[PDB]
Hints:
The structure is cut from a larger assembly and holds chains A (about 120 residues), B (about 150 residues) and C (about 150 residues). Chain A is an alpha/beta fold and about 120 residues long. Chain A has a single domain (about 1-115), classed as CATH 3.100.10.10. Chain A is about 45% helix and about 20% strand. In chain A, strands 1, 2, 3, 4 and 5 form a five-stranded parallel sheet that branches. In chain A, strand 1, helix 3 and strand 2 (about 55-65) form a beta-alpha-beta unit. The longest helix of chain A has 16 residues, at about 5-20. Chain A is globular, with a radius of gyration of 13 Å. The two termini of chain A are about 25 Å apart. A three-stranded parallel sheet of chain C has the order 1-3-5. A three-stranded parallel sheet of chain C has the order 2-4-6. Chain C is α/β, with parallel strands linked by helices. Chain C starts with about 60 loop residues before the first strand and ends with a helix. The chains hardly touch. The structure holds chloride ion (8 copies), potassium ion (K) (2 copies), magnesium ion (26 copies) and sodium ion (25 copies). Chain C binds three RNA strands through helix 1 and helix 4. Chain C: Keywords: Ribonucleoprotein, Ribosomal protein, RNA-binding, rRNA-binding. Chain C: Belongs to the universal ribosomal protein uL15 family. Chain C: Binds to the 23S rRNA.
Amino acid sequence: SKTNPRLSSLIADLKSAARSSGGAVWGDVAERLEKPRRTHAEVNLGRIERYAQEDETVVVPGKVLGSGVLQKDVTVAAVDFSGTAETKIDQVGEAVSLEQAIENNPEGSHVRVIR
Amino acid sequence: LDLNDKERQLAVRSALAATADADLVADRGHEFDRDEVPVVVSDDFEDLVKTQEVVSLLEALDVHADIDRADETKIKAGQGSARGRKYRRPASILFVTSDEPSTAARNLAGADVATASEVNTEDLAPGGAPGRLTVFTESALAEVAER
Amino acid sequence: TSKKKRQRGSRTHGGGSHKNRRGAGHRGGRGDAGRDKHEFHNHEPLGKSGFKRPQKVQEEAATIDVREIDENVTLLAADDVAEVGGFRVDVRDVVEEADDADYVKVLGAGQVRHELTLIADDFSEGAREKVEGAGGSVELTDLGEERQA
RNA sequence: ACUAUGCCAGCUGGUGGAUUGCUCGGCUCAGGCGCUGAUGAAGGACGUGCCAAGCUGCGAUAAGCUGUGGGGAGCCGCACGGAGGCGAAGAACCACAGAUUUCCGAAUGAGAAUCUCUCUAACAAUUGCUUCGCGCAAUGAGGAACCCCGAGAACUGAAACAUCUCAGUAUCGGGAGGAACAGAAAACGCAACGUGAUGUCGUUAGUAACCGCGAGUGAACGCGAUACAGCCCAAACCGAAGCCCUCACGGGCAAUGUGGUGUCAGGGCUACCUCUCAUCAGCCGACCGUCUUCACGAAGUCUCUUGGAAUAGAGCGUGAUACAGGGUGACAACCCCGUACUGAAGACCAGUACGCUGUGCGGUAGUGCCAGAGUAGCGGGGGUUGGAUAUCCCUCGCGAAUAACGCAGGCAUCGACUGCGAAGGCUAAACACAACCUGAGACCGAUAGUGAACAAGUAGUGUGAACGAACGCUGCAAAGUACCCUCAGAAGGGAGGCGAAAUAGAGCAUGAAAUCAGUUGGCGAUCGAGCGACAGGGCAUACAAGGUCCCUUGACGAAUGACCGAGACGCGAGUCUCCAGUAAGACUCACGGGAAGCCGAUGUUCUGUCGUACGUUUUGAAAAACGAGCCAGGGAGUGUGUCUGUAUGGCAAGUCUAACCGGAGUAUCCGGGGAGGCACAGGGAAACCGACAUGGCCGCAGGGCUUUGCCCGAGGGCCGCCGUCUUC
RNA sequence: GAGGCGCCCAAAAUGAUCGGGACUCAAAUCCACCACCGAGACCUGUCCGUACCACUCAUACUGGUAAUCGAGUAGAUUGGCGCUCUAAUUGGAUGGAAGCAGGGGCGAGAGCUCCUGUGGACCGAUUAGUGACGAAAAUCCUGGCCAUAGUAGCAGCGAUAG
RNA sequence: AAGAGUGCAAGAGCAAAAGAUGACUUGACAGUGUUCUUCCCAACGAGGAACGCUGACGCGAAAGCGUGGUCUAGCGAACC
Ligand SMILES: [Cl-]
Ligand SMILES: [Cl-]
Ligand SMILES: [Cl-]
Ligand SMILES: [Cl-]
Ligand SMILES: [Cl-]
Ligand SMILES: [Cl-]
Ligand SMILES: [Cl-]
Ligand SMILES: [Cl-]
Ligand SMILES: [K+]
Ligand SMILES: [K+]
Ligand SMILES: [Mg+2]
Ligand SMILES: [Mg+2]
Ligand SMILES: [Mg+2]
Ligand SMILES: [Mg+2]
Ligand SMILES: [Mg+2]
Ligand SMILES: [Mg+2]
Ligand SMILES: [Mg+2]
Ligand SMILES: [Mg+2]
Ligand SMILES: [Mg+2]
Ligand SMILES: [Mg+2]
Ligand SMILES: [Mg+2]
Ligand SMILES: [Mg+2]
Ligand SMILES: [Mg+2]
Ligand SMILES: [Mg+2]
Ligand SMILES: [Mg+2]
Ligand SMILES: [Mg+2]
Ligand SMILES: [Mg+2]
Ligand SMILES: [Mg+2]
Ligand SMILES: [Mg+2]
Ligand SMILES: [Mg+2]
Ligand SMILES: [Mg+2]
Ligand SMILES: [Mg+2]
Ligand SMILES: [Mg+2]
Ligand SMILES: [Mg+2]
Ligand SMILES: [Mg+2]
Ligand SMILES: [Mg+2]
Ligand code: NA
Ligand code: NA
Ligand code: NA
Ligand code: NA
Ligand code: NA
Ligand code: NA
Ligand code: NA
Ligand code: NA
Ligand code: NA
Ligand code: NA
Ligand code: NA
Ligand code: NA
Ligand code: NA
Ligand code: NA
Ligand code: NA
Ligand code: NA
Ligand code: NA
Ligand code: NA
Ligand code: NA
Ligand code: NA
Ligand code: NA
Ligand code: NA
Ligand code: NA
Ligand code: NA
Ligand code: NA
């Protein structure tokens, strides 16, 4: 099914973290990533700006894109970011990989899922 | 088969990176003894003429055993021989230079020669298998940086 | 393994009775045959509707919504005219495929969060109101004023 | 122990030619190149060899003659024979040039199925020039397609069919070239203060347009590319200042106009100013590149083992600007050809580019001097096209103006505006094809691939047009079997010889199945037919590649589950209670003993149970529904375009390049190229107008909290609101 | 008057039947009763597949659940076997490759593999590709072959020819 | 209490009426919908019906009635 070996590794790591540190978000994200690419999140910034609050990490089971404006200072964790998205986010906040999210927060506390 | 430029360019960069990983390179099957890969070399390599000179250099770099691996031919099963496809051999060492490819190295068993500006995925990863044992010229090594 | 790869041995390759998969009778006639009779379902109904004006008397407007302009002012500041806590932008310079169009028109979708002075050939009423209510102004190009007559 | 005629399976030997391996042939792609013929081509006929039937070559000089260059010690084609010859007087062989080149054939003195006739005489026929004489010339016919100009279907699609479609296709008539055609605006019409000959490629676009408004059909301008190139007449004004033939004399043409000028940058004339640039006619005349051919070209033929043979194994060495490919008695960079490098030639580019000679460009003012007629245009009737009142063409009829005029800008008329100058002509390069040369391949591999790897358009069929196969493989070396016996025998057989092998012995590598001969095992002349599956007996079995199996006893022991005996009940068959969930109970295991045709397995046969093939048609098939004698081999979802989903992957308010350009390791690949497409805003026939970066509620996942309940809640769901059309 | 069983009514074509033999206080019929036989059903041991659960990167292992899973034409869905040639990685062969014949082992199976003989030069595996890729059938195509069968014909004619 | 009548088949509906008589009046109106039917379930056009609204009217004291005929037949695409 999946041909990207890094996507598979990501998914395997998300499961290991959910089964141990009890973060149910990571399991939820793993299952969505296992679903067809078609269903994966593609989120622009306007959507993150609208639903995010500070000191709550935004989690995108998918990829973050660059339309819209992000003022809020937030940590956004995603499978990938467009070049523009990562640049706009790093100005007011922090763009981070899901692999880092799992490291800093294996229990998946204080996160909000956004698609 | 069509391929997006971005997607192809990504694979070029990715194959480049695989040459820097000694475990990957040994996994691919290349024979050599050293911790550090790819092998980088003085630009004077480009002024070499005789094949034997390259041999000595490679022997001195502990890398010549790959040439030994590639020096043997397989006479293939099946009817390809009737079409001129009788033979094949392992791939050994990719030599990446800057000005022009290396006539001195080219006839070494299994060797390929390439240039930093046009070196491609097949060069870096014959048969799509990443981690080819490579020698870069210092200038080549730098030129490849922007590919 | 593909579906197709599994057909050998099946005899009918998924076609049902071997009496199916013959000529065009199996499809109700060639192409759109029957679109008014046995196959009428889900075809547009028959007939003639409306008229067309000659391709050469038609004008093509290049359009942009204020939202696109406004979301981008900071990045366009690196390029077009920041002045007055305010921004001045000639819209013709912003819009892709402007020169290939008869005129440039600013439309009113979304919000204006800055004070903007906008130059274009035409404006929707809503684009004018939003740009003014944000304490900005709308400047009709010479060509824009010609359009009044 | 017998049993024939037979059945099944093997064994030995055939038959047969599958299979595997092999490739002197195909198929396809790519680069180069490209006309021949009256000076008789192409094609065909018949000849031609010491012996010569076929093919090839050649032409009475006849597998060939001559010259130059190359090449080289051999040679006398395919073709390995017998004889004989040629070559150092440099043959063979290759390149270029020349000689010879029968008859028919456009076929041309005339006739004729390849021969003949005559005034030794003929370009027949048509035609130009013409010394009016066939004196000088032209045409004819061929060619793989490509190209241009004419004539022009039908099956088919529309589920019938007529317009439409198939299709201006198939096919027919005429004709050119290496390419053809087109081509320097009476253009375009993103309408402009814009573009600027033509073709082609990519796009514009399945858009505009057509259409029983059905099915279908279907451009252009523009843009990005490729390649680029612009000119000559007619007339005005001049008026013989001219041209053709001939060595020359001389002849012919030409006032019905040869020649000068000139050609929208309008020109001419008149008067000026200025220039030697444009154009045109000439002369010279390539580089590089590309295609093909050629010269030169490094390094082992060392040791042991195996083998008929090392090109194998093991060991020791070597070259590489050369480790492409091939050959050689088996896997070869180093044995031979070649390959890298370097160099030479020919061909194409091209009589082109550059260079040069001659000519002379251009400007002002004046001048109604010149500027292409059955035309432009209109009507009748048709064809064709996307061309719609607005395509292009044919036919019949009518029919202008004269630059102070005329045509076009997709209905007509008038005015304005913008463009342009028809009714004369030429024109390089970029593009098509594939005969020819060469190269290439995830193509086929002898029932395939061409019809054709072979005598292949052969053998053979048809009056003819036309139709049309099958046939590849000894061996390292022919060492291709001497001698002897047999025989009617140059047969065949026996014996023998060669070779690693003859079961490699001549259509000879391998050598399947159907099937045949002989023979082995099993059955067998009292017995019944989907031929078997499963279980179990009997007989049969060299090894190998499987090693199990039998019997006594014991352990474990699911469901199930007793006898006898005792007590009680029933007319009776029998039942109940207890012995007892006991003994028993499939598999598995342990001790002891045993089997080696022994266990499995395989062949055949016997017994039990079940069983009227297979595939198809069918409501229903063993069917008295359809198909096949048997076996081998062959034998059926494929390509382009478009549309719509899906899975995976890149990038993301964007995304992708197309043709094409440059580079290079030269079809790959690296870098350019965003023309253009889709997406980013919709609604409306059109004019035209032009939207929620979130107001409210519910709430899954997830998160939070003081947790069995509260909170936040993307996505989702329900509203509200906004753009537009219709709308008093 | 009612009921039970039988009798008459009662004729068809090759050889009569209750499937047959045959049966008479039945081996028939009716009322009851007793013990048995007898499916792949039901119960039960072990294994297999499928679905689901726990653990896990992954049933790759391991453990667990199914009384409420296990038939199937057309058809939809999904894992796998085999064939050609390409590529990468990597092996085998004259101390005998492929093919073929006979035989041994594995796999539910497509098919894999070994031994012996023959053969005498080539042949694989894994991964990613490729496609003129799999036959029991079409009055299918071509070739070969058996029975038919030592059979029909080699007589017939106004010319019986030795 | 319904056998009459209510245009026409058959079945249904109707009595201070849906019938009869008299009078007045043109709602047999324009625009646009919801819904059912057509086509049970279950997609499909024309057509039909039920029920609204907006506008304008008729009648009535008014509530109200009038979306032709008490109800179910009386109907027809594109092109032109
Ligand atoms: Cl979004
Ligand atoms: Cl916040
Ligand atoms: Cl329009
Ligand atoms: Cl233009
Ligand atoms: Cl067991
Ligand atoms: Cl025991
Ligand atoms: Cl199919
Ligand atoms: Cl499987
Ligand atoms: K990124
Ligand atoms: K021309
Ligand atoms: Mg093979
Ligand atoms: Mg259909
Ligand atoms: Mg553009
Ligand atoms: Mg003649
Ligand atoms: Mg039809
Ligand atoms: Mg027709
Ligand atoms: Mg029709
Ligand atoms: Mg047409
Ligand atoms: Mg146009
Ligand atoms: Mg002149
Ligand atoms: Mg037509
Ligand atoms: Mg053939
Ligand atoms: Mg005939
Ligand atoms: Mg043989
Ligand atoms: Mg007997
Ligand atoms: Mg029937
Ligand atoms: Mg076959
Ligand atoms: Mg089933
Ligand atoms: Mg591998
Ligand atoms: Mg079949
Ligand atoms: Mg036959
Ligand atoms: Mg007989
Ligand atoms: Mg007689
Ligand atoms: Mg009514
Ligand atoms: Mg009514
Ligand atoms: Mg009609
Ligand atoms: Na189907
Ligand atoms: Na069929
Ligand atoms: Na149809
Ligand atoms: Na219809
Ligand atoms: Na443009
Ligand atoms: Na040529
Ligand atoms: Na001959
Ligand atoms: Na000749
Ligand atoms: Na002539
Ligand atoms: Na004459
Ligand atoms: Na039809
Ligand atoms: Na018909
Ligand atoms: Na039509
Ligand atoms: Na006409
Ligand atoms: Na025009
Ligand atoms: Na053959
Ligand atoms: Na037996
Ligand atoms: Na049938
Ligand atoms: Na059958
Ligand atoms: Na029957
Ligand atoms: Na027969
Ligand atoms: Na096939
Ligand atoms: Na673009
Ligand atoms: Na099925
Ligand atoms: Na309706």
